[PDB]
Each structure stands twice: as structure tokens, then as C-alpha cells.
Amino acid sequence: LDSFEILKALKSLDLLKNAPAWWWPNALKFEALLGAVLTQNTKFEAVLKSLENLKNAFILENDDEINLKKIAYIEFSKLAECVRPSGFYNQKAKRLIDLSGNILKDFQSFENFKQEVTREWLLDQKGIGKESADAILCYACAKEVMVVDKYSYLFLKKLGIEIEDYDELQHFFEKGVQENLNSALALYENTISLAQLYARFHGKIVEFSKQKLEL
């Protein structure tokens, strides 16, 4: 049992029929990074509300470079109010503002950030965990990184393989793909990237998990 076998089996379930191409809505945009941070320790449904708040308040509009600067310079207590629904809202506002200000400071623009960010840089941002860091890397920056989480741990454990450590679990999941790269890609069309494959693969596990299915 490896992650390629799991991908094929999950894929044949058609779990993403209703999803966008990268699973995460508004993938590859600033909003994906905001979601990746806001989703920590909460339900994604709640994250969607925070983003709705941000949009309804015209804090987030159509230009991501403007959006980045808006979040970096927004009054703490206003942002904190906005992201109430996803909980831990004072911590997350501070986290987002510091992150956004540090992106500007180190990378000048969100565009350049998407190109130059590393996991270690993200991990040096106070409050950003591996999962969030990785979700930013994959779902906001199109990097070849597969997010893992509690879902993936529990999903694998049920299939008979237990990997508690975040990095080893992720390596287990990435390596089965890497090892069968051409055959994994061939499941699609040779249309999509490996980053998108990971984006979708993690999506499948999440969806599989919410739907309460058996492999």
C-alpha cells in the first residue's frame, strides 16, 4: 500500500466532481493564503464567512497587491472583528497583519512572494503551522507540496499505516506520487501540474473524510 494506490482509488470515487480545478476555491490568489491561515484549528465553512466579511467590508477587492497592503496596514481590531467566525480571531488578525507586513518587507509584492517564498520563511512567521505554511505553498503559490493534516493521518491509519509526525506523513504521501509520477499524471490527461495533482489529492482526502466513506 502506497500513496499512488490511494490516489487511484480516491480518484475513482469522483470526489471532486463539484470542486474547482485546484479544489481550494480561489486558489492561486491572495484569498487562498488568507484561507490557509484562517482555517487553522477551525472549520472551512467558518473561514468562508470571514472572507465574506472581508469582501463585504471592501477590505478584500479584485487586486491582490492592493489586498496584501490592505491587510498589512489594516487596524488590528477591525481585522480581528472581521475574522471572528473562524475563531482565535485576535491571534489570527495579528498573524495575518504580521505575515502581510513581512511579505511586503521581504518580497515587495504578492506576485514576487509567490515565486520566492520558502516553507522556512513561512515557518518563521509567528503562528504559522506546517499545515498552514504548506497550504499557502500549494494552494496559494502553486508549489509542489502536499498538505497533510489530521484528516490524512486518520485516513492513513484506518488503511493500516500510522504516521504521527507531520513531515513523514507528508513524505509518505508525496513519495508514492513522485515514484509513479508518469502514471499518476496519466490519470488526468498530462493537462495538470504535480502541484495541482497534490492540490487535488489533498482535496480528495478531505472530501473523502467529510463524506464518511470507506476506500
Ligand X SMILES: c1cn2cnc3[nH]cnc3c2n1
Residues within the interface to ligand X (CB under 6 A)? 23-24, 39, 44, 206
Whichever of 23 and 208 has its CB closer to ligand X, that residue is 23
Whichever of 13 and 72 has its CB closer to ligand X, that residue is 13
Closest distance to ligand X from the beta carbon of 213 (Å): 15
Closest distance to ligand X from the beta carbon of 190 (Å): 25
Closest distance to ligand X from the beta carbon of 51 (Å): 11
Q: Give dist(CA 215, CA 202) in Å, integer.
A: 15
Measured CA angle at 64 (ends 62, 69), to 5 deg: 115
Whichever of 3 and 40 has its CB closer to ligand X, that residue is 40
Amino acid at 180: N
Q: Give dist(CA 165, CA 97) in Å, integer.
A: 29
Measured CA angle at 181 (ends 178, 182), to 5 deg: 165
Please give the torsion angle defined by the CA atoms of residues 68, 69, 75 and 79, in that order, rounded to the nearest 10 degrees.
-10
Q: Which stretches of the chain are DSSP H helices?
A: 3-11, 30-38, 44-56, 64-73, 76-82, 89-107, 110-116, 119-123, 130-135, 150-158, 166-178, 181-185, 194-211
CA atoms within 13 A on the CB side of 85: 14
Whichever of 44 and 89 has its CB closer to ligand X, that residue is 44
User: Of all residues in this chain, which one has the CB nearest to ligand X in the complex?
Assistant: 44
Whichever of 39 and 100 has its CB closer to ligand X, that residue is 39
Closest distance to ligand X from the beta carbon of 48 (Å): 9
Closest distance to ligand X from the beta carbon of 179 (Å): 26
